[PDB]
Design a protein around this ligand. Structure first.
Ligand SMILES: CCCCCCCCCCCCCCCCCC(=O)OC[C@H](COP(=O)(O)O[C@@H]1[C@H](O)[C@H](O)[C@@H](O)[C@H](O)[C@H]1O)OC(=O)CCCCCCCCCCCCCCCCC
Ligand SMILES: CCCCCCCC/C=C/CCCCCCCC(=O)O[C@@H](COC(=O)CCCCCCCCCCCCCCC)COP(=O)([O-])OCC[N+](C)(C)C
Ligand SMILES: CCCCCCCC/C=C/CCCCCCCC(=O)O[C@@H](COC(=O)CCCCCCCCCCCCCCC)COP(=O)([O-])OCC[N+](C)(C)C
Ligand SMILES: CCCCCCCC/C=C/CCCCCCCC(=O)O[C@@H](COC(=O)CCCCCCCCCCCCCCC)COP(=O)([O-])OCC[N+](C)(C)C
Ligand SMILES: CCCCCCCC/C=C/CCCCCCCC(=O)O[C@@H](COC(=O)CCCCCCCCCCCCCCC)COP(=O)([O-])OCC[N+](C)(C)C
Ligand SMILES: CCCCCCCC/C=C/CCCCCCCC(=O)O[C@@H](COC(=O)CCCCCCCCCCCCCCC)COP(=O)([O-])OCC[N+](C)(C)C
Ligand SMILES: CCCCCCCC/C=C\CCCCCCCC(=O)O[C@@H](COC(=O)CCCCCCCCCCCCCCC)COP(=O)([O-])OCC[N+](C)(C)C
Ligand SMILES: CCCCCCCC/C=C\CCCCCCCC(=O)O[C@@H](COC(=O)CCCCCCCCCCCCCCC)COP(=O)([O-])OCC[N+](C)(C)C
Ligand SMILES: CCCCCCCC/C=C\CCCCCCCC(=O)O[C@@H](COC(=O)CCCCCCCCCCCCCCC)COP(=O)([O-])OCC[N+](C)(C)C
Ligand SMILES: CCCCCCCCCCCCC
Ligand code: NA
Lengths: 642, 94
């Protein structure tokens, strides 16, 4: 009714007992269901914790008393909002947000399912609208709220234990939801990684045979891959450098130590779900990420990902990439002679007469083959990825320019057999693109690759800003000049062309006398060669210097991502050629699984030195008694026992 | 090197003068300015009447001040725009 929400709102537990007496005399069951606030579904219970005072209403104990004596207690606590916008938000969710440890205890005693799915649009994915996504389940609310006490409670209370393994509408478990909630700030990162640990550690105490991190949501994404696909570097850094020193939660570690002789200590990083794995590799999810996907370029600076790629580089990709640079250089030397030595008489196609004219056809045939090759490699890149229209034009600057080179090649073939001299028009573009596209292969080299990243950035921010204003000025004063000219440079091309000679230092200030006003002609060109040459070109240099100062580290980390995409494509191009990827690692016994069996893992070694943490009685060292690779080790009867 | 931030803040002032002149050029054209806001009940005036104000919403996130028993929240029980809210019988009383 109206007065009940008024009395449940106002902390006044006197009028309620009068209505305990009232609802006694009909049923309390449907009448409370009819006293659910329409358009929201709020029974009196949810209303109470909303209007709290110092962490207690004092009607909440009473409203439970009305429901325990008189039948049907469940339908008050299992009740929730009815609206589609708070759909499924039980009163248990309220106590978890308001940080009331007690009311979480009180409600779960009286039922209050700990698996109630807060479906509502407020509780769904980001939506571009106001809302807080935590994972729709009360255990995920507590984890994303800094309530660790409420986490441990809901799993071992006495009555109903939360499910670590349960999923939301979008399939995200609690740990997935710890990834969705991360926002790359330090205090969030400090927390989420702390709370990621505890549930992940708790899931070895309870349910010791699950491996939560292997759980995949509706989109087939694990918490690690979801941290890498969504730009979550702090969580990624945590999951990857994860070392847990506790014995029964050591198998959940991921950064191990294999020996420590003095300051030296050799760490092992697992490579599960990073190398060319089954579903979603962390390298693929980072390397083949959409362009927004924050910190694409920093997610690989997370150790061991640098060393792992630099391992693949120095072991098989470097020797393949330099063969790709060679076969492309030869291809450019052959499409260049076949073009330099083209026929200059008659119409195409051109019959063969001499031996020198035979060699070029081998160079012309073989040259079209690469165009067919670089044409399909752009179709593969299209269908293997399905890049959006955005991603297609904003981060794929290489594949555009090899595919584009390929189109001028095929057009050069279509026109060489259509009897038209425009084959040359396309054939020379395909050369100029082709040689410029050797700047692709500067990415096997750190200094030349970073140099070519700066070229990319300069073209996009500094030169595109420049060439707008320059073409506006050029076309602007150009029209003003040719308007003034009377009968030759009485054209808009030759005036725009002469006014572009100034910037390249070839401008005659007297390229016409065919005008009637000379002050007008020279005030107008001086205006031009001050605002374009003196100002706007020298300003460009100034802008570049500002740019170079800023993109120094950004260009090094776009380079490592460029090189990474080459490492992955090289792996993925040779599933058949050599065998796969040479596996970039070794299968080592890190310890024993919690069921006693061996824990063999594909692990990456990183020798490290430390001049401060001298003593460090580790114990977590997995093969100390042999202190290196050497031959097989003892396994060190310490912490492991099986 | 020096005018990087100064040029961003002359730009926003350039754009602002365009926003205002656009508003002031169309007192007759469309109607005025589309009002850039919403008339919300923030609370009650000290004489008990409603305090309706044209207010601009800014969603914000905080990972340090977790608990913050605000109370000053003006429409907590509905926790968003959604549909009309309860007004939260806390601090307001009228
Ligand atoms: C109306 C017109 C319609 C047009 C529709 C079709 C347009 C097609 C072309 C579009 C582009 C036209 C050129 C202007 C754009 C810039 C070019 C450039 O610098 O991109 C650098 C590129 C980088 O690679 P990637 O992509 O791997 O790097 C990505 C990238 O850094 C990303 O940000 C990272 O996140 C990601 O990790 C990383 O991986 O590097 C190369 O592409 C090798 C070097 C290539 C040479 C670079 C110099 C300039 C080349 C262009 C000029 C060619 C000259 C001859 C022209 C003849 C005809 C006139
Ligand atoms: C048939 C004949 C064809 C033509 C000849 C060529 C045939 C094909 C040639 C294939 C082999 C490619 C060169 C390998 C050189 C040794 C590698 C090395 O150690 O480099 C060092 C540096 O060295 C440089 O930076 C050198 C210059 C780099 C630009 C490209 C030079 C290519 C040479 C030919 C140009 C031809 C142009 C086109 C001509 C038509 C190491 O690199 P870094 O700087 O330390 O960075 C590495 C990354 N890291 C440090 C992070 C790990
Ligand atoms: C006629 C005038 C021609 C030029 C007009 C240009 C438009 C006018 C004004 C442009 C600057 C203002 C717009 C900024 C857009 C930001 C969004 C974005 O992604 O931008 C991208 C491209 O943004 C471009 O503007 C590039 C468009 C042209 C591509 C190069 C063609 C060659 C031009 C050569 C000159 C000769 C032109 C042709 C011959 C005359 C760049 O941003 P980004 O790469 O994302 O940077 C961060 C990357 N990160 C997130 C991975 C870290
Ligand atoms: C991106 C390009 C870079 C390279 C070019 C750099 C320059 C800029 C490129 C500009 C592209 C357009 C060139 C001119 C139009 C086409 C030709 C034509 O019919 O012209 C007519 C229009 O006569 C005029 O005087 C031009 C009027 C404005 C047309 C251009 C609009 C703005 C384009 C953007 C302007 C830049 C500023 C805004 C954008 C930043 C007549 O002139 P005409 O050509 O002699 O025609 C034959 C006449 N005849 C029969 C007497 C012989
Ligand atoms: C990633 C960055 C690197 C890649 C860059 C990729 C490319 C970048 C560049 C791109 C520019 C390409 C322009 C088109 C090709 C050349 C013009 C042409 O065909 O002229 C023909 C016709 O032209 C006309 O009739 C044009 C008339 C308008 C003049 C404005 C353009 C002036 C061209 C220059 C502007 C320079 C601007 C420089 C700064 C932008 C020749 O003219 P005509 O028949 O002898 O005389 C007719 C005259 N009338 C018709 C006007 C009376
Ligand atoms: C940024 C905001 C906008 C700015 C607007 C700026 C524009 C404002 C200005 C507007 C006025 C422009 C001139 C009007 C026409 C005058 C006559 C003429 O041109 O030629 C006449 C004389 O030719 C000569 O060369 C003789 C001197 C002429 C007058 C020179 C005035 C200089 C003023 C400087 C002012 C500096 C202003 C600086 C502004 C920063 C006709 O003779 P001719 O056949 O053409 O001559 C060829 C024979 N000869 C070789 C013997 C010479
Ligand atoms: C380190 C890398 C950089 C430096 C070296 C760069 C390469 C060497 C440097 C410079 C080249 C010097 C000139 C070559 C000969 C002239 C052209 C010719 O005879 O045949 C034709 C074109 O030629 C071709 O398409 C290539 C094959 C040429 C024939 C001889 C075999 C060369 C094999 C090379 C194998 C690939 C390259 C090597 C890798 C496998 C001529 O066609 P036409 O229509 O009859 O025109 C008449 C011409 N003529 C009257 C003069 C005959
Ligand atoms: C008279 C002369 C005598 C001497 C002759 C001397 C002969 C000299 C040799 C070659 C001449 C040209 C032959 C074709 C190759 C073109 C260049 C090329 O492929 O470069 C690639 C290297 O390529 C390789 O590493 C593999 C070699 C090519 C295999 C397929 C050839 C095309 C056949 C038809 C296939 C149709 C079906 C397509 C699917 C199979 C470039 O490497 P990438 O790693 O690909 O990187 C570029 C791509 N990306 C930058 C966009 C990422
Ligand atoms: C993304 C697209 C889909 C990709 C997948 C499928 C791709 C298609 C599959 C295979 C490839 C086939 C593509 C179509 C070719 C048709 C012929 C042709 O273009 O002729 C051109 C000739 O050329 C010139 O005039 C100058 C050079 C430009 C040619 C550009 C062709 C490629 C597109 C590069 C874009 C560059 C611009 C963008 C970068 C700045 C046009 O002139 P013409 O017709 O010869 O005129 C006289 C002849 N006529 C009387 C018959 C008219
Ligand atoms: C210089 C490379 C070839 C330029 C001519 C292109 C048309 C086709 C020539 C050979 C035929 C290929 C099928
Ligand atoms: Na000069």
């Amino acid at each position: 009714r109206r007065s009940i929400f008024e009395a449940v709102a106002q902390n006044n537990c006197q009028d309620l007992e009068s209505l305990l007496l009232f609802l006694q005399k009909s049923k309390k069951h449907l009448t409370d269901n009819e006293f659910k606030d329409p358009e929201t579904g709020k029974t009196c219970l949810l209303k109470a914790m909303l209007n709290l005072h110092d962490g207690q209403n004092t009607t909440i104990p009473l409203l439970l008393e009305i429901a325990r004596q008189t039948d049907s207690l469940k339908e008050l606590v299992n009740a929730s909002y009815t609206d589609s916008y708070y759909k499924g938000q039980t009163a248990l969710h309220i106590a978890i947000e308001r940080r009331n440890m007690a009311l979480v205890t009180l409600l779960v005693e009286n039922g209050a399912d700990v698996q109630a799915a807060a479906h509502g649009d407020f509780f769904k994915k980001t939506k571009g609208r106001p809302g807080f996504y935590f994972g729709e389940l009360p255990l995920s609310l507590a984890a994303c709220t800094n309530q660790l006490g409420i986490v441990k409670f809901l799993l071992q209370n006495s009555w109903q234990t939360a499910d670590i393994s349960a999923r939301d509408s979008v399939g995200n478990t609690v740990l997935h939801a710890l990834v969705e909630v991360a926002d790359n700030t330090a205090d969030n990162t400090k927390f989420v990684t702390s709370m990621y640990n505890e549930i992940l550690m708790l899931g070895a105490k309870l349910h010791p045979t699950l491996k939560l991190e292997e759980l995949t949501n509706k989109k087939g994404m694990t918490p690690l891959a979801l941290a890498a696909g969504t730009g979550k570097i702090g969580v990624l850094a945590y999951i990857l450098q994860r070392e847990i020193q506790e014995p029964e939660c050591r198998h959940l570690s991921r950064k191990f130590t294999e020996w420590a002789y003095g300051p030296v200590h050799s760490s092992l990083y697992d490579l599960s779900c990073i190398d060319t794995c089954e579903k979603n590799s962390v390298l693929e999810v980072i390397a083949y990420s959409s362009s927004e996907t924050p910190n694409r370029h920093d997610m690989l600076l997370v150790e061991p990902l640098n060393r792992l790629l630099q391992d693949k580089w120095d072991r098989f990709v470097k020797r393949i990439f330099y063969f790709n640079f060679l076969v492309y250089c030869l291809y450019m030397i052959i499409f260049t002679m076949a073009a330099y030595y083209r026929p200059v008489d008659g119409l195409p196609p051109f019959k063969m007469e001499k031996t020198g004219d035979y060699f070029r056809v081998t160079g012309e045939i073989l040259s079209v083959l690469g165009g067919v090759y670089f044409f399909f490699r752009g179709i593969q890149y299209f269908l293997q990825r399905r890049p959006s229209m955005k991603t297609l034009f904003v981060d794929s600057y290489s594949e555009m320019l090899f595919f584009l080179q390929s189109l001028f090649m095929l057009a050069t073939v279509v026109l060489y057999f259509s009897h038209l001299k425009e084959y040359v028009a396309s054939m020379v573009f395909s050369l100029a693109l082709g040689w410029t596209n050797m700047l692709y292969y500067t990415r096997g080299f750190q200094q030349m690759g970073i140099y070519a990243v700066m070229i990319e950035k300069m073209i996009l921010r500094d030169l595109c800003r420049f060439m707008f204003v320059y073409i506006v000025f050029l076309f602007g004063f150009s029209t003003a000049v040719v308007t003034l000219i009377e009968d030759s440079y009485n054209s808009l091309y030759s005036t725009c062309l002469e006014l572009f000679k100034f910037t390249i230092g070839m401008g005659d200030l007297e390229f016409t006398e065919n005008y009637d006003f000379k002050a007008v002609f020279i005030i107008l060109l001086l205006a031009y060669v001050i605002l374009t040459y003196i100002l706007l070109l020298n300003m460009l240099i100034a802008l570049m210097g500002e740019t170079v100062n800023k993109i120094a580290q950004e260009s090094k980390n776009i380079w490592k991502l460029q090189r990474a995409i080459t490492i992955l494509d090289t792996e993925k191009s040779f599933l058949k050629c050599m065998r796969k990827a040479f596996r970039s690692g070794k299968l080592l016994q890190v310890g024993y699984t919690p069921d006693g069996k061996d824990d063999y893992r594909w692990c990456f070694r990183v020798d490290e030195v430390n001049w401060t943490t001298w003593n460090t009685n580790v114990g977590i060292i997995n093969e100390d008694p042999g202190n290196c690779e050497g031959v097989k080790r003892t396994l060190s009867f310490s912490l492991r026992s099986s």
